[PDB]
Amino acid sequence: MDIRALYDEKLTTPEEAVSSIASGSHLSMGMFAAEPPALLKALADRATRGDIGDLRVYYFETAKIAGDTILRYELNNRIKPYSMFVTAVERALIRRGIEDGGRKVVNYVPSNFHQAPRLLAEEIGIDTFMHTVSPMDCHGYFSLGVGNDYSSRIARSARRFIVEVNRYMPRVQGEAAAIHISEVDAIVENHVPLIEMPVRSAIPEYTSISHIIADLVPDGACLQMGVGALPNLVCGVLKDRNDLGIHTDVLNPGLVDLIRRGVVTNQRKTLDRGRSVFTFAMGQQEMYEYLNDHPAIFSRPVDYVNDPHIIAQNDNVVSINATLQIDLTGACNSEHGGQLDFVRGAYASKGGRSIIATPSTAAKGTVSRIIPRIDGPVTTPRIDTHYIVTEFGAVNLKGLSSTERALRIIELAHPDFRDELTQAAKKMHLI
């Protein structure tokens, strides 16, 4: 029961902490800012020395921290990335693999986000879990801070749990967010700023888009915002609303801003009334600091937060997700997320709306993000799609025929590409 003693017995160095990790094992880690840099550097270095091999890392939503350490292309034969989301980090790796005569260097693991804890703990199994945590408190508890995700489960299902103490990690209240030291296998300390979402200059379509979206947000809305710059910027147009609620997978500066301004009260939610619910956080230092010891912000595991059945129990849910391209059947692609969970959840909510938004064009106006049809697997299938938004308007696709869909979708395209899309639709027998 002496925690100061337990802490010292378990405190060690990053090199020593990762030194026991077996070759041929399964390892996992926290998402994004919760990725532990000192441990990951130490683990990568070990691969470089040739002291570990055939190590599978199972993870979600990469950051530069993993990318510059264990996920560096040079190590791909020893530390094998087994990704479940594809971000920029993997795309670079896939790209390089193709250049090397079609090497498969990233093992995508198809999975629903809301099923992540079960998949990692049971179907796959994780031997070592690593995570950045807030400093131990007077009761011997660490906080997963900006993470709950699948981390709150795997931190316990894993045979070894190694934490990286960082005072820049906010202490965050949440379900299974707190970890007692008795549940920890090793500690290293590393105090550095959390990696930040880059602050991106708004592109001009986002003005039109956001104002379209604002008209689709009813009073007493329960917001979810997806990974992306667009959803974040959209929050800003809701600065004059009141009594909004938050039940989101991603907590971002846009949403946190609405909390700070008291726009969000969570008083009209059915579940978790009074508190804003999130499963992990991406932002900047200003945001990260604000989450510290906040009594009206409450993190919960992904199999709760992203369960479409749970989402739908709040009235007037508004789900706002970005996509890379939409085709004429209304399907959506986000490969050049937990999106589908909230598309489904939002629709089932009493008065709910799933919005998927994108600017209609890319590359200085030269490529269309609205296209005739998508190649292979889609992110949001057409049957599930609800509302889609571009700078040219919004269409509710539920109940529309293949034909009615194609026509309304073409009209959301840039007038340049409309004629050519209409022609494609004819050759495709959608019209």
Side-chain angles (χ1 to χ4, degrees):
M1 45 164 290
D2 186 19
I3 63 173
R4 289 168 189 90
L6 258 154
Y7 191 110
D8 293 332
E9 181 60 83
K10 278 162 175 177
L11 185 51
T12 60
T13 68
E15 192 190 85
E16 194 280 336
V18 301
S19 66
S20 45
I21 297 170
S23 290
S25 67
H26 293 7
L27 180 143
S28 180
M29 46 170 178
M31 306 183 46
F32 197 65
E35 283 171 359
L39 291 172
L40 288 176
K41 171 166 167 186
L43 178 63
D45 288 15
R46 216 180 117 170
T48 298
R49 296 188 319 252
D51 198 73
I52 193 169
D54 193 27
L55 180 79
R56 302 183 182 196
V57 184
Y58 289 72
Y59 65 79
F60 274 88
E61 197 73 38
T62 56
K64 179 175 177 181
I65 311 175
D68 291 353
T69 61
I70 53 158
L71 296 195
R72 280 193 325 263
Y73 190 74
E74 316 96 58
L75 302 175
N76 202 272
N77 54 333
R78 296 189 163 271
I79 302 181
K80 306 192 184 193
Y82 265 85
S83 167
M84 293 177 182
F85 274 3
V86 155
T87 86
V89 175
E90 288 74 31
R91 288 195 291 265
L93 285 181
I94 304 274
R95 218 185 64 99
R96 288 162 158 69
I98 296 297
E99 276 171 9
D100 287 47
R103 278 187 66 200
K104 175 73 166 169
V105 304
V106 172
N107 291 267
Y108 183 77
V109 174
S111 65
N112 289 278
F113 189 34
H114 81 272
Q115 301 166 356
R118 163 180 188 185
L119 223 72
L120 287 170
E122 298 167 29
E123 318 282 9
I124 299 175
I126 295 294
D127 302 309
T128 304
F129 190 70
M130 305 194 310
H131 203 283
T132 308
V133 297
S134 75
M136 170 179 275
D137 66 14
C138 36
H139 300 296
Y141 281 96
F142 303 91
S143 176
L144 293 176
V146 293
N148 208 296
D149 55 73
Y150 51 91
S151 310
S152 52
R153 169 68 180 289
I154 303 325
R156 276 129 181 152
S157 66
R159 296 91 186 108
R160 291 280 172 268
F161 180 29
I162 313 172
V163 306
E164 181 157 321
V165 177
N166 186 357
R167 66 175 167 260
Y168 288 62
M169 178 64 70
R171 176 163 26 246
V172 173
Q173 304 171 11
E175 179 181 12
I179 311 267
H180 194 259
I181 168 133
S182 59
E183 284 175 283
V184 159
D185 290 275
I187 313 157
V188 303
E189 303 181 333
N190 193 35
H191 306 289
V192 299
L194 301 185
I195 205 193
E196 303 189 343
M197 220 179 52
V199 65
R200 294 191 67 94
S201 176
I203 58 104
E205 291 107 300
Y206 289 1
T207 299
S208 297
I209 299 191
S210 67
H211 283 92
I212 295 157
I213 290 178
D215 284 288
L216 301 180
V217 179
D219 283 326
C222 197
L223 308 174
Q224 175 270 342
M225 300 297 172
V227 176
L230 171 48
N232 190 85
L233 291 170
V234 167
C235 289
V237 78
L238 306 171
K239 282 172 176 173
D240 301 325
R241 303 298 179 86
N242 279 103
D243 293 282
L244 301 193
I246 288 176
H247 179 111
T248 182
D249 41 17
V250 186
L251 181 62
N252 60 16
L255 288 170
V256 167
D257 184 55
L258 294 181
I259 296 167
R260 214 192 263 98
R261 305 172 91 95
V263 165
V264 170
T265 70
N266 287 308
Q267 280 305 317
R268 299 205 188 167
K269 282 164 61 179
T270 291
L271 308 183
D272 309 287
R273 188 180 181 186
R275 57 201 191 198
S276 311
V277 172
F278 74 114
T279 204
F280 80 117
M282 305 175 70
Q284 293 100 34
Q285 196 198 54
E286 178 100 345
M287 192 194 95
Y288 294 143
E289 274 158 7
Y290 182 85
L291 309 175
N292 192 68
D293 278 310
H294 203 306
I297 297 187
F298 192 83
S299 90
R300 306 196 58 163
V302 65
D303 55 322
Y304 171 81
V305 176
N306 277 59
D307 181 336
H309 176 69
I310 294 293
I311 299 167
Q313 279 176 64
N314 287 326
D315 295 6
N316 300 293
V317 169
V318 178
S319 172
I320 299 184
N321 289 311
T323 205
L324 297 178
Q325 47 171 32
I326 303 183
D327 75 36
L328 298 181
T329 75
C332 298
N333 189 36
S334 311
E335 199 176 345
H336 218 39
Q339 182 178 111
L340 183 46
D341 296 329
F342 273 94
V343 172
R344 290 164 81 225
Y347 188 63
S349 165
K350 265 165 63 186
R353 292 170 167 84
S354 174
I355 302 165
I356 292 159
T358 189
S360 66
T361 53
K364 195 203 150 205
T366 61
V367 171
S368 190
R369 288 202 173 279
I370 302 184
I371 71 169
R373 168 181 68 83
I374 291 173
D375 284 334
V378 297
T379 304
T380 297
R382 52 153 171 195
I383 61 181
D384 279 313
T385 310
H386 190 201
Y387 266 83
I388 60 184
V389 176
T390 68
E391 63 265 37
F392 293 106
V395 180
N396 179 347
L397 292 184
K398 291 286 187 183
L400 300 182
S401 64
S402 281
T403 295
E404 298 164 316
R405 283 168 178 259
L407 287 185
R408 296 289 300 274
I409 288 173
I410 286 171
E411 293 317 318
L412 294 185
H414 191 335
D416 291 342
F417 295 73
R418 294 187 187 168
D419 289 343
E420 179 214 316
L421 276 167
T422 291
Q423 198 180 25
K426 280 179 184 310
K427 184 180 185 175
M428 202 159 288
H429 291 98
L430 290 181
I431 190 59

